[PDB]
Amino acid sequence: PRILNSDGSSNITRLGLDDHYHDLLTVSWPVFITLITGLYLVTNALFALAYLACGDVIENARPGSFTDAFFFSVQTMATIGYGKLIPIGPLANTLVTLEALCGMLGLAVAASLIYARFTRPTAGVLFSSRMVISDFEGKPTLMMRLANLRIEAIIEADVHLVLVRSEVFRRFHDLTLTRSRSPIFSLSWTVMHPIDHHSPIYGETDETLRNSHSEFLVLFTGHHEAFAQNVHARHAYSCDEIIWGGHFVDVFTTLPDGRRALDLGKFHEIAQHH
Amino acid sequence: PRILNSDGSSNITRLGLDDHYHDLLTVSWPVFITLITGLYLVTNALFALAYLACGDVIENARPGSFTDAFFFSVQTMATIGYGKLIPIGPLANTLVTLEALCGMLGLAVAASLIYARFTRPTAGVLFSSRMVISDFEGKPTLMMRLANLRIEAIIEADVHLVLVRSEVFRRFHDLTLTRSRSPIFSLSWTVMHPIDHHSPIYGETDETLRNSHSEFLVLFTGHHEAFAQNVHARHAYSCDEIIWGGHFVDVFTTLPDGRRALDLGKFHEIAQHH
Amino acid sequence: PRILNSDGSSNITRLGLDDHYHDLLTVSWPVFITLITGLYLVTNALFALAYLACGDVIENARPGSFTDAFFFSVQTMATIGYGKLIPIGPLANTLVTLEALCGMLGLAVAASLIYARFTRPTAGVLFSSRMVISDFEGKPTLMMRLANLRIEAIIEADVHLVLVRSEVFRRFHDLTLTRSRSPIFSLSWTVMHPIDHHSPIYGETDETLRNSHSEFLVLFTGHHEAFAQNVHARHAYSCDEIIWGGHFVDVFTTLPDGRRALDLGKFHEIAQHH
Amino acid sequence: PRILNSDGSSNITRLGLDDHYHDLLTVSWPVFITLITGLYLVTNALFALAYLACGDVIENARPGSFTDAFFFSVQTMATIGYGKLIPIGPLANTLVTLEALCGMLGLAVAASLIYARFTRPTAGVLFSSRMVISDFEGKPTLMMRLANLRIEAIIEADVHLVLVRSEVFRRFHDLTLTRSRSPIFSLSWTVMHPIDHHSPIYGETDETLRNSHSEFLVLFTGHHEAFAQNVHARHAYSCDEIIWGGHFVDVFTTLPDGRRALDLGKFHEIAQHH
Ligand SMILES: C[N+](C)(C)CCOP(=O)(O)O
Ligand SMILES: C[N+](C)(C)CCOP(=O)(O)O
Ligand SMILES: C[N+](C)(C)CCOP(=O)(O)O
Ligand SMILES: C[N+](C)(C)CCOP(=O)(O)O
Ligand SMILES: [K+]
Ligand SMILES: [K+]
Ligand SMILES: [K+]
């Protein structure tokens, strides 16, 4: 009955065109391509209907046939203009310059959206599968760790541990970290909340966390070098993914070569006295 | 006589091409489309005038008729180039490559503006219709609440309560909140200023707020997930939209299903002992 | 001999293609348009030379004449393609698809720069012409003021007063303000540094400021609503633009109408007991 | 055996299509242009295959020859449309409007990437070649300096000194600076960590730094005026590029002219009593 999925998402049901811009960036690429295509056809229909609205003014076109007009409208709106289907007199030539204004316009738009919904990057940060409470520097510290999956660095990265106990009727406690901030994050970061007299989970234990039905949330944010742009990430845990007394395994091996390396294979390994 | 509308706007009359870029992003889409269209026509007129400036150099064109030239200029600037109206000799062919440089250029521009004035997103945050001062955790706290209307989260969101009392001759007091910051805001947030000995509105009452003719302003800001981009929102209240002793109604229902839900229907409901 | 102009610029002479991107955004629009145009011509020359590099493969072209080729190259790179000058066999048709890849490419680029060097907005903030040191709330406060010239608001705006005394050999002191931050700035802001025992200019006087040959710098920054984008501004003063004992004149008139107004006409007015 | 190169890069070996967007921005321009070109050809092959998939419907084309189709597909997808190779009946004309949707689309994309991987600017900040520990204002201060190579200013710039001692097993200490922040950085900045009882390198000496095999990292960040966009920079030192007792040489000459100047020639000069 977790309020929060591992992926940081919420499990609350919400209850309730008017937000086009947002929606446009939001729909599955399948759907997006669809809509664009539809608007593409519809306008050409309109235009080709406007060419018929006057006496057929386009040359090399069958009489009253929309098939021809629609296709002239397309060749005309997309600036191919072979030269078979061609305008006639003032009326056609005007609808043409007007259609073209629209073509050029529609591109600007279509492109603007493409770019808007293209350049939203992911942090590419990995979260540890589990959380561990154990002694660090003489205090039962609760910690979790994250790693940068890419070569390029995230800079001025900051992370937030956040308890969500139940109590009445829901507490949102921002947990104090030994280090909330890292002016740069390129390999691995083990974030830790020392449990002390001000910690909410102070004196707390497993049975008491389950009783509060407490869950923990991680908010990562930073500015990715690769994108010269800001990025974020979430992840959530529950009392049943906290290894008590566990210690994370060292991810830095020294190679036979002698050169130091990072081994993301040990990233989820956790040591425990049994 | 409120200085501030509910929507956060100001009621002060201000007294006073030189700011083109701003203006361009600012005018109603109707007007914007207009201007672009105008510049579109005018240049073609210029160009078509430049084609006439030399002996008619374009083929299949009536003599001295601008109608033909203007339309050749359009087919030429928009790169349709059917092949009926076609250049001749050095002069025409040059104006052509020059016109085309301009077409391609004008698109880049037109598009750049489109995109600039397209990708300014709204926060899609709802503000509570009323403000309520009542006891919270043993102190007369003044509070108001806001909700995220979309699925996607706003992150590192922060809100500001701000008093605007009259006194001489106008005070701008930033009110201290129990929580100015939320590393994430996806459902509902009830912002609260505990009234204590440092509160400006400390000891204050309704009649005294009206006497100061005090108003309150809310500034919301955050970084929207949906847009990977920053967003803001304003809202303002007055002494006559503060329910004294009111309590906001809980917006989280637990469904018969057993799953928890958010009910924005109760968002404006406020309980009051009578 | 001011180190700093009113406009915040520096008067230090600096002593010393390798920075293309920056340069490209930096050069006068005249120059920018030029460069683009040049690259436009040069490539077409190259391409038209590549069409001649094979036997004339383009139809309706004079033999060996580059004039024809260059113009075919343009009609071809800009996708007009009338249909007079047309390709022949494998070679021409290939250079064509290759040229077109380049056309489409060059646009993307040209546009990208246009947009990059277009969407750098100005804050549109006015700085007061003079600075005044005088009593505010029982302390000789040094202050200056700025105003938002546009309707749209700047949000989370912050300002910095900064002394630049000479002493050996140059001090950079960030002056403490009564209010460094304004969660919103839509009309007028009077920024003030109370002179107290920690103020650098504490006990200081005019003759002593001139002796230190001290100057003051203002850094404004905020996030403009109009552009959904960040903006900045600078301005600098000198000891000979500080009215001692001066008071800024109130910029808010109440209209005969009864409605309150902002009068930027009084913005530079400063009252003084004589 | 430095963990960190002068350029701020790491020397850790990492151990391990699924990240297309990132990759696309990441690959050498040579490679990028390649991929785009490939996708350009492949689709045309597909389309030209779709034109053959029906009876040759394009006019002026040899039977079953893909050469013709592929080239018609290109003239058609890139909107040149000479008018030699032209469609026929419903089928061809449809694939045409469909191809064109794709052309226009592919541009939007190609461009979006171009722009994304174009507008990632460099700070253009120079780092001093060496670091020096020596007395400043009565305390052994460790300092290094950086300079703005361009005319345009970086604003709200901040720098971080960061020790990386070995100890078990690696310490990441953020060193306290006399000035971590500069609301503007246009010429030269000498950043300094006073060594006091809280300094990690307090009481430390050269032999002891080498023994800890300590290295130092500099993180620069700010918002460049030239780009109206955020920028960063890194640089790293080692115990063998710290001149003990060294003093940086003054970079500001006063010209014979009388005007003050900045001389980046002395930027790396360091004075030392011998
Ligand atoms: C040391 N750290 C855990 C603060 C953050 C990361 O530093 P790094 O190992 O990625 O360079
Ligand atoms: C708890 N809160 C009021 C601080 C902010 C919102 O948290 P959430 O309910 O949107 O996840
Ligand atoms: C009051 N202020 C001086 C802090 C800033 C501006 O407020 P406003 O008059 O622009 O709304
Ligand atoms: C003085 N400083 C070292 C803080 C930063 C730079 O100021 P400036 O010399 O670039 O104007
Ligand atoms: K075209
Ligand atoms: K064309
Ligand atoms: K044609």
Side-chain angles (χ1 to χ4, degrees), chain A residues 1-138 140-167 172-206 208-259 261-274, chain B residues 1-138 140-167 172-206 208-259 261-274, chain C residues 1-138 140-167 172-206 208-259 261-274, chain D residues 1-138 140-167 172-206 208-259 261-274:
Chain A
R2 39 179 336 157
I3 313 180
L4 286 161
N5 311 7
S6 330
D7 66 6
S9 88
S10 176
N11 271 334
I12 278 60
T13 317
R14 301 169 143 283
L15 307 187
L17 177 91
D18 324 347
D19 194 359
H20 43 273
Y21 181 76
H22 163 277
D23 298 349
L24 284 165
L25 305 189
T26 277
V27 296
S28 44
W29 278 107
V31 173
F32 176 80
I33 286 155
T34 298
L35 290 164
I36 280 199
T37 300
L39 182 54
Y40 178 59
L41 299 189
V42 173
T43 64
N44 278 301
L46 298 185
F47 266 110
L49 230 48
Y51 293 112
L52 296 169
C54 357
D56 353 78
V57 296
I58 144 202
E59 171 144 314
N60 288 337
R62 296 173 284 167
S65 72
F66 173 86
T67 314
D68 303 40
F70 167 71
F71 285 137
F72 169 68
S73 173
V74 314
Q75 302 173 19
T76 196
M77 182 190 56
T79 75
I80 319 176
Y82 293 118
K84 279 282 175 149
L85 304 179
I86 279 185
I88 297 174
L91 294 166
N93 280 290
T94 321
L95 270 182
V96 171
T97 93
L98 177 63
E99 180 130 35
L101 188 48
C102 289
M104 293 187 295
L105 285 188
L107 181 53
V109 181
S112 293
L113 299 185
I114 304 296
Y115 178 75
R117 54 173 296 150
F118 223 90
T119 68
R120 298 169 307 192
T122 50
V125 163
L126 179 54
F127 290 83
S128 62
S129 74
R130 307 269 189 282
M131 228 166 190
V132 327
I133 300 170
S134 58
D135 283 357
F136 172 64
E137 288 187 345
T141 306
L142 156 77
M143 51 195 137
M144 56 85 39
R145 75 175 168 191
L146 18 118
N148 184 359
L149 298 160
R150 301 156 176 170
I151 314 81
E152 308 80 12
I154 304 177
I155 74 162
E156 289 304 341
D158 61 356
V159 186
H160 278 265
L161 295 174
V162 173
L163 167 56
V164 187
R165 270 205 237 95
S166 187
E167 59 202 30
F172 200 77
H173 285 98
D174 208 335
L175 307 191
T176 327
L177 309 183
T178 77
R179 156 169 282 107
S180 249
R181 243 295 207 298
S182 193
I184 190 171
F185 173 36
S186 44
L187 303 142
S188 168
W189 185 357
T190 297
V191 185
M192 16 188 182
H193 164 81
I195 312 176
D196 74 349
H197 36 267
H198 302 122
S199 171
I201 60 173
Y202 179 55
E204 213 77 343
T205 77
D206 173 70
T208 86
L209 293 171
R210 283 215 169 72
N211 274 349
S212 47
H213 224 282
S214 28
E215 297 174 39
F216 301 75
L217 174 57
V218 199
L219 315 170
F220 175 87
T221 36
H223 165 101
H224 218 301
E225 250 185 28
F227 307 104
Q229 205 185 337
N230 283 294
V231 303
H232 70 266
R234 314 192 225 91
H235 195 78
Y237 307 85
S238 46
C239 12
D240 57 342
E241 25 219 48
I242 301 179
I243 296 89
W244 293 74
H247 294 116
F248 282 123
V249 177
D250 190 1
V251 186
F252 300 100
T253 308
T254 299
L255 283 199
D257 190 347
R259 50 195 180 103
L262 183 73
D263 188 19
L264 294 177
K266 298 152 196 301
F267 188 72
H268 291 289
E269 290 198 38
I270 296 185
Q272 203 165 348
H273 177 266
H274 289 260
Chain B
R2 39 179 336 157
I3 313 180
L4 286 161
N5 311 7
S6 330
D7 66 6
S9 88
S10 176
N11 271 334
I12 278 60
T13 317
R14 301 169 143 283
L15 307 187
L17 177 91
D18 324 347
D19 194 359
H20 43 273
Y21 181 76
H22 163 277
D23 298 349
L24 284 165
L25 305 189
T26 277
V27 296
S28 44
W29 278 107
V31 173
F32 176 80
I33 286 155
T34 298
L35 290 164
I36 280 199
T37 300
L39 182 54
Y40 178 59
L41 299 189
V42 173
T43 64
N44 278 301
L46 298 185
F47 266 110
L49 230 48
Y51 293 112
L52 296 169
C54 357
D56 353 78
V57 296
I58 144 202
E59 171 144 314
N60 288 337
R62 296 173 284 167
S65 72
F66 173 86
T67 314
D68 303 40
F70 167 71
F71 285 137
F72 169 68
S73 173
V74 314
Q75 302 173 19
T76 196
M77 182 190 56
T79 75
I80 319 176
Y82 293 118
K84 279 282 175 149
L85 304 179
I86 279 185
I88 297 174
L91 294 166
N93 280 290
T94 321
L95 270 182
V96 171
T97 93
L98 177 63
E99 180 130 35
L101 188 48
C102 289
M104 293 187 295
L105 285 188
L107 181 53
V109 181
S112 293
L113 299 185
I114 304 296
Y115 178 75
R117 54 173 296 150
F118 223 90
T119 68
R120 298 169 307 192
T122 50
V125 163
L126 179 54
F127 290 83
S128 62
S129 74
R130 307 269 189 282
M131 228 166 190
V132 327
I133 300 170
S134 58
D135 283 357
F136 172 64
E137 288 187 345
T141 306
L142 156 77
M143 51 195 137
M144 56 85 39
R145 75 175 168 191
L146 18 118
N148 184 359
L149 298 160
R150 301 156 176 170
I151 314 81
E152 308 80 12
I154 304 177
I155 74 162
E156 289 304 341
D158 61 356
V159 186
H160 278 265
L161 295 174
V162 173
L163 167 56
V164 187
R165 270 205 237 95
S166 187
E167 59 202 30
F172 200 77
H173 285 98
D174 208 335
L175 307 191
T176 327
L177 309 183
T178 77
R179 156 169 282 107
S180 249
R181 243 295 207 298
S182 193
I184 190 171
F185 173 36
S186 44
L187 303 142
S188 168
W189 185 357
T190 297
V191 185
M192 16 188 182
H193 164 81
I195 312 176
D196 74 349
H197 36 267
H198 302 122
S199 171
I201 60 173
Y202 179 55
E204 213 77 343
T205 77
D206 173 70
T208 86
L209 293 171
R210 283 215 169 72
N211 274 349
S212 47
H213 224 282
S214 28
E215 297 174 39
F216 301 75
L217 174 57
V218 199
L219 315 170
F220 175 87
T221 36
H223 165 101
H224 218 301
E225 250 185 28
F227 307 104
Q229 205 185 337
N230 283 294
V231 303
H232 70 266
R234 314 192 225 91
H235 195 78
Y237 307 85
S238 46
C239 12
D240 57 342
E241 25 219 48
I242 301 179
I243 296 89
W244 293 74
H247 294 116
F248 282 123
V249 177
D250 190 1
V251 186
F252 300 100
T253 308
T254 299
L255 283 199
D257 190 347
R259 50 195 180 103
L262 183 73
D263 188 19
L264 294 177
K266 298 152 196 301
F267 188 72
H268 291 289
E269 290 198 38
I270 296 185
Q272 203 165 348
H273 177 266
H274 289 260
Chain C
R2 39 179 336 157
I3 313 180
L4 286 161
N5 311 7
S6 330
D7 66 6
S9 88
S10 176
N11 271 334
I12 278 60
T13 317
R14 301 169 143 283
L15 307 187
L17 177 91
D18 324 347
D19 194 359
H20 43 273
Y21 181 76
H22 163 277
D23 298 349
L24 284 165
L25 305 189
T26 277
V27 296
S28 44
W29 278 107
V31 173
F32 176 80
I33 286 155
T34 298
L35 290 164
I36 280 199
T37 300
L39 182 54
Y40 178 59
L41 299 189
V42 173
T43 64
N44 278 301
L46 298 185
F47 266 110
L49 230 48
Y51 293 112
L52 296 169
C54 357
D56 353 78
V57 296
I58 144 202
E59 171 144 314
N60 288 337
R62 296 173 284 167
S65 72
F66 173 86
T67 314
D68 303 40
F70 167 71
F71 285 137
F72 169 68
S73 173
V74 314
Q75 302 173 19
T76 196
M77 182 190 56
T79 75
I80 319 176
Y82 293 118
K84 279 282 175 149
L85 304 179
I86 279 185
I88 297 174
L91 294 166
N93 280 290
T94 321
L95 270 182
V96 171
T97 93
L98 177 63
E99 180 130 35
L101 188 48
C102 289
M104 293 187 295
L105 285 188
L107 181 53
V109 181
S112 293
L113 299 185
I114 304 296
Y115 178 75
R117 54 173 296 150
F118 223 90
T119 68
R120 298 169 307 192
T122 50
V125 163
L126 179 54
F127 290 83
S128 62
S129 74
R130 307 269 189 282
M131 228 166 190
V132 327
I133 300 170
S134 58
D135 283 357
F136 172 64
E137 288 187 345
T141 306
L142 156 77
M143 51 195 137
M144 56 85 39
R145 75 175 168 191
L146 18 118
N148 184 359
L149 298 160
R150 301 156 176 170
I151 314 81
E152 308 80 12
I154 304 177
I155 74 162
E156 289 304 341
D158 61 356
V159 186
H160 278 265
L161 295 174
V162 173
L163 167 56
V164 187
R165 270 205 237 95
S166 187
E167 59 202 30
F172 200 77
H173 285 98
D174 208 335
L175 307 191
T176 327
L177 309 183
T178 77
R179 156 169 282 107
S180 249
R181 243 295 207 298
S182 193
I184 190 171
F185 173 36
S186 44
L187 303 142
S188 168
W189 185 357
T190 297
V191 185
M192 16 188 182
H193 164 81
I195 312 176
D196 74 349
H197 36 267
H198 302 122
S199 171
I201 60 173
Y202 179 55
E204 213 77 343
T205 77
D206 173 70
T208 86
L209 293 171
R210 283 215 169 72
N211 274 349
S212 47
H213 224 282
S214 28
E215 297 174 39
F216 301 75
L217 174 57
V218 199
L219 315 170
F220 175 87
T221 36
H223 165 101
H224 218 301
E225 250 185 28
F227 307 104
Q229 205 185 337
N230 283 294
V231 303
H232 70 266
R234 314 192 225 91
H235 195 78
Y237 307 85
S238 46
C239 12
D240 57 342
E241 25 219 48
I242 301 179
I243 296 89
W244 293 74
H247 294 116
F248 282 123
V249 177
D250 190 1
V251 186
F252 300 100
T253 308
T254 299
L255 283 199
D257 190 347
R259 50 195 180 103
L262 183 73
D263 188 19
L264 294 177
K266 298 152 196 301
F267 188 72
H268 291 289
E269 290 198 38
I270 296 185
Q272 203 165 348
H273 177 266
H274 289 260
Chain D
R2 39 179 336 157
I3 313 180
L4 286 161
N5 311 7
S6 330
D7 66 6
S9 88
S10 176
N11 271 334
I12 278 60
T13 317
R14 301 169 143 283
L15 307 187
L17 177 91
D18 324 347
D19 194 359
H20 43 273
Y21 181 76
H22 163 277
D23 298 349
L24 284 165
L25 305 189
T26 277
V27 296
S28 44
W29 278 107
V31 173
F32 176 80
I33 286 155
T34 298
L35 290 164
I36 280 199
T37 300
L39 182 54
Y40 178 59
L41 299 189
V42 173
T43 64
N44 278 301
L46 298 185
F47 266 110
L49 230 48
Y51 293 112
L52 296 169
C54 357
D56 353 78
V57 296
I58 144 202
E59 171 144 314
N60 288 337
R62 296 173 284 167
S65 72
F66 173 86
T67 314
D68 303 40
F70 167 71
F71 285 137
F72 169 68
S73 173
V74 314
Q75 302 173 19
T76 196
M77 182 190 56
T79 75
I80 319 176
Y82 293 118
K84 279 282 175 149
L85 304 179
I86 279 185
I88 297 174
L91 294 166
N93 280 290
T94 321
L95 270 182
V96 171
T97 93
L98 177 63
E99 180 130 35
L101 188 48
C102 289
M104 293 187 295
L105 285 188
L107 181 53
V109 181
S112 293
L113 299 185
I114 304 296
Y115 178 75
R117 54 173 296 150
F118 223 90
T119 68
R120 298 169 307 192
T122 50
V125 163
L126 179 54
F127 290 83
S128 62
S129 74
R130 307 269 189 282
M131 228 166 190
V132 327
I133 300 170
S134 58
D135 283 357
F136 172 64
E137 288 187 345
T141 306
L142 156 77
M143 51 195 137
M144 56 85 39
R145 75 175 168 191
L146 18 118
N148 184 359
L149 298 160
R150 301 156 176 170
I151 314 81
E152 308 80 12
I154 304 177
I155 74 162
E156 289 304 341
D158 61 356
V159 186
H160 278 265
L161 295 174
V162 173
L163 167 56
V164 187
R165 270 205 237 95
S166 187
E167 59 202 30
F172 200 77
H173 285 98
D174 208 335
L175 307 191
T176 327
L177 309 183
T178 77
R179 156 169 282 107
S180 249
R181 243 295 207 298
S182 193
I184 190 171
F185 173 36
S186 44
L187 303 142
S188 168
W189 185 357
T190 297
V191 185
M192 16 188 182
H193 164 81
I195 312 176
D196 74 349
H197 36 267
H198 302 122
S199 171
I201 60 173
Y202 179 55
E204 213 77 343
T205 77
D206 173 70
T208 86
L209 293 171
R210 283 215 169 72
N211 274 349
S212 47
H213 224 282
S214 28
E215 297 174 39
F216 301 75
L217 174 57
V218 199
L219 315 170
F220 175 87
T221 36
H223 165 101
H224 218 301
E225 250 185 28
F227 307 104
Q229 205 185 337
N230 283 294
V231 303
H232 70 266
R234 314 192 225 91
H235 195 78
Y237 307 85
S238 46
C239 12
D240 57 342
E241 25 219 48
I242 301 179
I243 296 89
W244 293 74
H247 294 116
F248 282 123
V249 177
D250 190 1
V251 186
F252 300 100
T253 308
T254 299
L255 283 199
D257 190 347
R259 50 195 180 103
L262 183 73
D263 188 19
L264 294 177
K266 298 152 196 301
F267 188 72
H268 291 289
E269 290 198 38
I270 296 185
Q272 203 165 348
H273 177 266
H274 289 260

